[PDB]
Design an enzyme around this catalytic site. Structure first.
Site, PDB file in Angstrom:
ATOM      1  N   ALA A 298      35.588  40.495  24.752  1.00  0.00           N
ATOM      2  CA  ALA A 298      36.181  41.784  25.094  1.00  0.00           C
ATOM      3  C   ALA A 298      36.374  42.612  23.836  1.00  0.00           C
ATOM      4  O   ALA A 298      36.449  42.060  22.725  1.00  0.00           O
ATOM      5  CB  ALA A 298      37.512  41.605  25.803  1.00  0.00           C
TER       6      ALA A 298
ATOM      7  N   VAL B  30      36.055  38.581  19.969  1.00  0.00           N
ATOM      8  CA  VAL B  30      36.481  39.973  19.891  1.00  0.00           C
ATOM      9  C   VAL B  30      35.310  40.869  19.474  1.00  0.00           C
ATOM     10  O   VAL B  30      34.726  40.670  18.412  1.00  0.00           O
ATOM     11  CB  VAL B  30      37.634  40.111  18.901  1.00  0.00           C
ATOM     12  CG1 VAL B  30      38.030  41.568  18.735  1.00  0.00           C
ATOM     13  CG2 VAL B  30      38.818  39.255  19.361  1.00  0.00           C
ATOM     14  N   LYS B  31      34.972  41.813  20.330  1.00  0.00           N
ATOM     15  CA  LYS B  31      33.905  42.763  20.074  1.00  0.00           C
ATOM     16  C   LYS B  31      34.469  43.960  19.295  1.00  0.00           C
ATOM     17  O   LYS B  31      35.470  44.562  19.691  1.00  0.00           O
ATOM     18  CB  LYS B  31      33.291  43.256  21.378  1.00  0.00           C
ATOM     19  CG  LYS B  31      32.757  42.133  22.235  1.00  0.00           C
ATOM     20  CD  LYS B  31      32.304  42.622  23.591  1.00  0.00           C
ATOM     21  CE  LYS B  31      31.069  43.460  23.509  1.00  0.00           C
ATOM     22  NZ  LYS B  31      30.525  43.809  24.850  1.00  0.00           N
ATOM     23  N   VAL B  32      33.795  44.299  18.198  1.00  0.00           N
ATOM     24  CA  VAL B  32      34.193  45.384  17.332  1.00  0.00           C
ATOM     25  C   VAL B  32      32.980  46.318  17.176  1.00  0.00           C
ATOM     26  O   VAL B  32      31.900  45.855  16.813  1.00  0.00           O
ATOM     27  CB  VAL B  32      34.594  44.841  15.953  1.00  0.00           C
ATOM     28  CG1 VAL B  32      35.005  45.958  15.017  1.00  0.00           C
ATOM     29  CG2 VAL B  32      35.713  43.799  16.091  1.00  0.00           C
TER      30      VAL B  32
END
Ligand code: CL
Ligand code: CL
Ligand code: CL
Ligand code: CL
Ligand code: CL
Ligand code: CL
Ligand code: CL
Ligand code: CL
Ligand code: CL
Lengths: 220, 220, 220, 220, 220, 220, 220, 220, 220
Positions: free
Chosen positions: E58, E84-86
């Protein structure tokens, strides 16, 4: 492009001539033998089964050039404008030269190599028929042979055309067409596969179902 | 395309001229020597063996340009329209220029490189003959040389043709033809291999057997 | 890499064993027939002509698998460690399997196609011999067949090696070597061409002339 | 490499197991139907026809995953180590996952696309069987699909193998082998074509004739 | 290979997890917004819908690196092992470095170029997600970008994987897989197309019809 | 992979070291001159601006090998572990050999050709810096030079790395990375272009707008 | 194709004009300097050495466009139809435009890049001379430059021709010819290598030896 | 080929028009803004700086099609034969169609994709300007886009030409020229780089030094 | 090139005809069904929406050739110059032949393979419509099919054109255009994506900001 069927099955030719844009029908000794009818019976029947419009091809049986010329004359007496198929052997090449001098159109058949095919065109053949599947089945590349042959004709004997023959799968026919062959002859099973596809039938069924859903019928 | 036989074997030329679509016969000093007949005997015989229709080629022996021109005149006194082969050496190029000025057609022979071959065409040669097998046997690529030479002629001396020569296998001849060579000369063994194939013989036999099975004979 | 000569010429083997780094000698029925000496005479002579160090190969003649196994036993009684050549036909494959079970090393010969060759390796053959020039002469590509065969062995039967055979020109041999063939057998004419070059002789002569010019002799 | 026959013809399997280096026999519902014998008869007969050494494959018929698992259990009760073929559909993928959990080896069949095939391997199939000729006949490229599928397995599911299937010509099988397929299954006609060649027969006949000429017999 | 679904549709994930061999589910802000459920509701539901076995991804929303790190902590408090998508922007790269130092796994998303993607891997991202269809729709080549990116990671940041994303057709996904991508995420429509084919359905129906014809039923 | 900035702008280095995963900073005489601060001022500032962890590079100015060694010592007295850049000229190669003997790491700079670059590595340089844009601007191919140089190092001097330099557009940097370069140095403008894209900004804005639409805020 | 010699050696030109098919002679300042004779002496001597039939080229020395135009007028007063060589610099381009307006034919020389060469043709030069070996010696690709330049002229300035120059080996000249160059100029050493081959001499010697063997002399 | 300068620098255009073979000058809003002079001042000055012979281009500023047409009329009132640049957006395409109907020539600008460019030509634009460096800087391939666009125009809208624009290095311009672009516009720095080379200067200097050495001066 | 929209949305056609250079509109049974208006209502509305200038296409629904001809006549009574779409099935090919004889222009639709498509052109179709995305979605290559089909038409049926159809992304349309397709039909979403780009909008905004900075407004 000239599209032929490779068959002596008169009933099938009549049915398929309505569907396919045929230039005519090709026969060979095995095809004729399989049908069991002599040449003087089956050739006129094939001619009729195409409504008198198609070109016919049939093959000599003699093993000497002189005998092959005599066979050609017999074939032309059955069908006045028939193209005479001559196997590309030493005597066959001699026969092709003689038939050129007599003004009788020929096809160089039983071609298993590109140079062999080219020789037949240089000798006078209007068509050259590599046996694609035979080359494939015997450890070669039928498609490379056809590709090479077409290039050779277009460079060195540009009046002549490849008439690709001997097929077990539509892919072989497609690859010959992509190589530039200006004519081709299909056996019935391959021809029928080329016009029948599950994915196409599904596309048409979806069109029918959508139309039904909106308009309550499947007709226009 | 012009197809030649590379031979001084008069009996073979007569026999093969009936089979192959020949443009003529090429000779060289080794071929003439092997046949043991002098030029003034064998050249007229070869001309007759092709029914007076084929083109002939024969080679000078002198090592100076002036001597090569004198050899050319001798050759032309034997066969009036003969094409004179000149080795592409420094004196050979000088000779080719002189023969161009005299209106005598020439072939640049003993070509082992593409630039060498092109020089002979720029000097006036109508034909250029790379020695394909010699290049192959000596660690080069005869086919790359031919490919390059043909491209050079078509770009830079478009009146000239490659006459590919020196062959031990049909594959070398095929590759020269695929490279675009507008003429070729075959030794008798390679020519005979190019028209005789076990697979083709087997195809013809199968046709005969099928015909026999259906009709009780192998004739049409 | 294992380099072989393809010959029954005992005098030539002697002379060439001193020059080439030979792994041995291969024979076939035509080569043996040409030499006119029976197997029980020529095979021991060939073994001696290589100083007892070279590997030998010889071919079965029987047409049934059982007969071929018996031929293999006869060959092994003449030369204890001989590799037995079996033509890759239906009965040949059956024989190869039987010889594998008996622990007798085999070579699959008369290979004209890559899949045919692979089958012989899967059956147990340690070597597979495509007939490069035969494929080339009959309108195929000997080099493509070898390229394909080597790839097939390395992927699918990695214990087996290509032993490329049947050559008319050094270029064919070079191309087999560049395709990766782990063994090769050369006829004498091709082997001799591969070590004799006019350009190399000219380089050595220039070295000698320069040395003479500086030092007044051609010796060190 | 694992070589299979695609057949239910017990007599043919017995005859061919002596010639070919077979890993086993594959069946499918059409093949079984064509042979007319039920699974519990024909599978044990096939197993014996290979001398108890070959691997067998047979296909489930149910259309739900739970039904396919039950079919797998029935098949395994006939042949304890059989590989179970499951069509790669949504329910088929679900079944493949369940069978992986049960430790029953599977093959993902009726593969017409590379991604579809990969999904079956990711789900647990040990083998994936593209239908090469079906893809070819329906206007695609069977060989591109196989090439792509093999690459996908080797990158993304390296425990799985392509088992190429559905062939009308040896060339299709050769191209699958060249693409790297670690297993293949051949119909009888294509298998027999792969070991019978006019050019090979001619080579062997020449060996016999040369031997006869020199020694007065054709035996060793 | 890791196969993901790109969705927030919990019911669909539960249904498809039984069919596909899933590694997990990826979400992004648009996907979450479309489902209308907040992160603290939908992420635990998705985790359960995969039976607690799948990996989840996400995306952060903040625009400063410090804010993105705080968002990462919030996400990890919902799902302890979430990736964690950045977005790979200047502040995103700064955040990826900080998260690497904190030991929180990251994915570099919204990648429209290969160099951009590589920077995110060099900064510490375990996964890099090019938006294949976005690049395609905007006049570029999504497949070339993916091909280049995968090569860059394997040479220059070999701990990182491409997670190819953003698809409108199965062909895009196939091309990413062929380029070597070690992970991929599919929207539901494309995933369903990849397992449903008219030609496959027709093959299965033919098997059933042949079985019926022989045995009087369609069950085993 | 080692990523450097090619700059003497201390403020920018500090700001960008937080964003990019930097291995250090490279300088050259023009860069230093443009910044107007002497070496003994700016090098320590650059070292700090990377938090004492980045590698620094600076270039000698002398034209004799002995002078270049003295310059190297002056550079090392400013930054103890600095890598000394030496232009790859005759005297530069002599200097590189001397510095190798002294244990001072070097980079071979002002490389305009692949062989030139390889010589510097064979002499002892740890890095070789082709001037990509200079080669491009002067009618060559900077990318071909880099591609060739990298291959040469990996084959012939595998301890050495390419440090690609001199860029006007991100594409040049991408192409160097795709060629395998193990290090690269970017001017500030190109580096900033590589992390700022209108399409990426638009993707992030769409995510924010969709999130706002569903949840009434743009924060997580 | 136009073939030139690149020389001021009047005796050699006279000797070689008898052998090569020369279009003329090109000179440059270094070639003229090496010969030590002033332009007003050597140019008329070169013109005579070719029997008044060859084209001449010579180069301006001034560094301003106006000076170059004056140099052109001086050159044309020595040889009325001489082609004036102008280095392709900023002032050279300006001079080429002025000479185009005056109707004096020009060649754009000292070309080290393809775009630079194209600019000279767009400005009015009839010939463009890349310095092939200079580009090769300085770490570029002379052949790529020539290939690119020829393509650019044929697309964008089709009245102009490449006159390839600066050679150390026949292979460079061959490669220029294969790239399509419509003119070339050779130094004497390369020209002589292109017509002298040990293999060719060996072929001719073999012809002589075979002729001697058969006929007892080496003359025709 | 039409070569333009991309500038509003009147003094530079006058100076460079003497050196380059210019077809005219292109402007855009950023270029005009950078020069600080209004259109009705700078456009007539540019026209004069090329001696009244060059073609001019300038860009509309309005965002609606109707506004763009009004801007076109204003531009044409300043320079009667000016080509009007229209950004290829939805309203831009509408404007291009309207201007085609009015007989006012247009250029489709701000092209970042090949299909986008083609649409502008199909709508009536005579020129299409891809922003090569912008595409390169933003992670794409400017050269692939140009290559594709040129192919598309030549196949599908053959009256239209590519006018390649947006350059940071001569290599980009060279690659556009090699792709076939029939027009190009260069910024001043790239144009100047394309005519100034250290290797060319060194060649000219060597010619001068050799001339001096022989003749005691550097003039002719 | 002929650009069509694939739609029955009359309002959208009117709006888009002002922006796109449209040749007309294509419909199919699903498209018509989705719009819910009968043919005799929607076809005249579509014709009006393009100002009476666009070509229209619509599809027959009958399953026999005779029924399809009757459907064609009904369609032509609604729109006199309409092109009639016929699915390329066995009966469809028969219908195409009949319609060719009647002089009614046809398009061969639901094409999933190149040979199938060619057959429709040989039978008389003026256009052939491969379903690009359907082929892509079903595990094939839509672009290879289009590429092959276009080549086949240009070699074998040169009066016929490919009308590429069925698209989910602009990249598919681009690739069809690059393959040479002389016509294409776009769904509305893809068409709109092809003219809207974030990078282009950013370029236009930068032009506006620069203009504002210099002149204090954004208008001309
Ligand atoms: Cl043809
Ligand atoms: Cl030729
Ligand atoms: Cl091997
Ligand atoms: Cl596999
Ligand atoms: Cl990856
Ligand atoms: Cl490196
Ligand atoms: Cl040229
Ligand atoms: Cl153009
Ligand atoms: Cl088309």
């Amino acid at each position: 492009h000239e599209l032929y069927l490779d068959t002596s099955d008169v009933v099938a030719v009549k049915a398929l001539s309505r569907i396919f844009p045929l230039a005519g029908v090709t026969t060979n000794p095995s095809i004729i033998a399989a049908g069991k009818k002599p040449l003087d019976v089956v050739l006129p029947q094939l001619h009729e089964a195409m409504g008198g419009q198609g070109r016919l091809f049939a093959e000599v049986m003699a093993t000497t050039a002189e005998g092959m010329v005599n066979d050609a004359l017999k074939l032309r007496s059955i069908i006045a404008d028939i193209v005479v198929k001559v196997p590309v052997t030493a005597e066959g090449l001699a026969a092709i030269k003689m038939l050129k001098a007599e003004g009788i159109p020929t096809l160089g058949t039983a071609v298993y190599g590109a140079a062999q095919g080219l020789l037949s065109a240089l000798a006078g053949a209007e068509y050259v028929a590599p046996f694609v599947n035979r080359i494939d089945a015997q450890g070669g590349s039928g498609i490379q042979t056809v590709t090479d042959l077409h290039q050779l004709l277009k460079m060195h004997a540009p009046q002549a055309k490849v008439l690709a023959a001997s097929f077990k799968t539509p892919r072989q026919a497609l690859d010959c067409l992509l190589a530039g062959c200006e004519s081709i002859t299909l056996p019935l099973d391959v021809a029928q596969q080329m016009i029948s596809y599950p994915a196409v039938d599904a596309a048409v069924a979806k069109f029918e179902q959508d139309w039904q859903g909106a308009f309550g019928r499947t007709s226009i």
